[PDB]
Structure 1
């Protein structure tokens, strides 16, 4: 199916043999504070996920709360750089950096990170694509927008995704460095979120690997009527349908559980 491999510095990801699991490592400060406690705790969680079946570590320090502190750019670099340096040293796994800021990604790669995960799809700081250009890394372009005016959800999603790919390409990014994401949980009502799930397969005609990020999200809450810590089965279900719909990556909190489900789908869908 894919006639190429995802090239990340010393690591090489195969897009055909199995659904690739991206482990979420949330590194967002809950107060102003680098210290051993945090970095150490991030490493052990990364190690856990590696043990549990993860193929990628997604380090993000921009989660949007509640309970998280507002962090300025130069502050996020000081916080997120040490995290990257230690994890990539003790956890032999490619790391993505979950940011939409250009100067953050720059420093994250320099500090040893391999993939950019942009939740704004180069739209917030188009500069980020140039950083993606230079260091020649894979960049994940997520569907997002600043409003919810959709004529036709899927058609508009695909349009926005292409506007992103354009910015990427014009800055220098090769096709083989581009991953797409429907941005489930972003600027979509619970109903649109469902629709986008139901119609994921359409993104495949763009010709890029697709990554899905639905782990624990509110729309699962809305359907199942369940708080964030009780959305494993919901998440599960989304991961299954996402894989049946042709996704190549899933970005999840429950690496152990999700990994077995991804494995069971791969067998069934014949991956």
Structure 2
């Protein structure tokens, strides 16, 4: 099915063998500094190790979202260094800022993860190309008047691709993300879930990030820490509909669900 592997400096991610699990690293900044003091970085490393032991294939590390420019680096850079040295797994870096991206890679990060899909700061894609790292382009926008949910997402993603490619990004460094929970009503989220398979016509691996998001809340009527089951359902449907990757919080539980899906669908 994919005739190529994801190339990540020292690491090689096979796209045909299993749904790949990306572990969300939660950055808890020290209130008493702006930098990379012992507590934030040691907790980060701790968490990264736990996730590695629970089945994660990629550690995702993001500094601002939920900022400054200077601050993003000073807080993101020491964590990539430590997790890099102490955990043997590719790291993605979760930013839409070109500078931030750059520094992150030089610090050891391997994948770029841009929630603005290169629309943010198109320069990001040039960085992407320059280091030859895979870049995840997520669907997003600053409004939500849609002619047609699906047709628009596909158009939009495609607009991100154009930017990536016109910067020198190879098809094989491009991954897409439908951006569930961004720029969509709870209803539009469910519809996208229900039609995720349409992203495949674009020809690129797909990552899904629905972990504990708000729309799961809406359906189950349940707070952020009670969304394991709801997340799991979104994960399963995503694998059945063709996801190469899922970005989750609860790595132990989702690896098990992913691996059971993989066996059943025959990946």
> TM exceeds 0.5?
yes
- How far apart, CA to CA, are the structure 1 residues paired with 2:156 and 2:125? 16
Question: Compared with structure 1, are the counterparts of its residues 88 and 190 closer, same or farther at alpha carbon in structure 2 (3 Å cutoff)?
Answer: same
SS at match of 1:171: coil
Aligned-partner Cα distance in 1 for 2:221–2:54: 28
Cα distance 1:160–1:171, how it changes in 2: closer, same or farther (>3 A)? same
The CA deviation string for residues 98-119 of structure 1, in whole angstroms up to 9 with x for no partner, is 0001100000000000000000
Deviation, 1:27, is 1.5
Structure 1 residues 11-67: Cα deviation after superposition (integer angstroms, max 9, x where no partner) = 000000000000000225374621111100000100000000000000001222xxx
Deviations 1:109-148 (A, max 9, x none): 0000000000000001000000001000000000000100
Q: Determine if contact 1:117/1:140 at 8 Å carries over to the other structure.
A: yes
Q: CA contact under 8 A between 1:138 and 1:179: conserved in structure 2?
A: yes
Q: Distance in 2 between matches of 1:179 and 1:223?
A: 28
Normalising by structure 1, we get a TM-score of 0.97
C-alpha displacement of 1:77: 0.4
In 1, are the aligned partners of 2:29 and 2:40 still within 8 Å (CA)? Answer: no
Aligned equivalent of 2:213: 217
Contact kept, 8 Å, 1:28 with 1:63, in 2: the verdict is no
The answer on whether the counterparts of 1:26 and 1:63 sit within 8 Å (CA) in structure 2 is: no
Alpha-carbon distance change, 28 to 174 in structure 1, aligned in 2, over 3 angstroms: farther
Deviation of 1:76 after TM superposition, in Å, equals: 1.1
Does the CA contact (< 8 Å) of 2:211 and 2:248 recur in 1?
yes
TM-score by length of 2: 0.98
Q: In the TM superposition, what is the alpha-carbon distance from 1:158 to its structure 2 partner? A: 0.1
Structure 1 gaps, min length 5: 65-70
- 1:124 & 1:132 partners in 2: Cα distance? 14
Match among 79, 94, 97 for residue 93 of structure 2? 97
Question: Are the aligned partners of 1:28 and 1:62 in contact in 2 as well (CA < 8 Å)?
Answer: no
**Aligned pair count?**
265
How many angstroms apart in 1 are the aligned matches of 2:47 and 2:219?
29
List per-residue Cα deviations over 1:138-181 (Å, max 9, x = no partner): 00000000100111110000000000000000011000000000
Specify the SS of the correspondent of 2:152: helix
Contact 2:92/2:109 (<8 A) preserved: yes
CA contact 1:138–1:176 (8 Å) conserved in 2: yes
Displacement of 1:253 in angstroms is 0.2
Cα 1:129–1:32 change in 2 (3 A) is farther
Q: Secondary structure, in 3 states, of the residue corresponding to 2:12?
A: strand
Segments of 5+ residues of structure 2 without an aligned counterpart are none
Asked whether the 8 Å contact 2:22–2:246 carries over to 1, the reply is yes
| Equivalence for 1:68 | none
Cα 1:131–1:242 shift into 2, 3 Å: same
What RMSD over aligned residues (CA atoms) do the two structures have, in Å? 0.8
Contact 2:217 2:224 in 1 (8 A): yes
SS at match of 2:166: helix
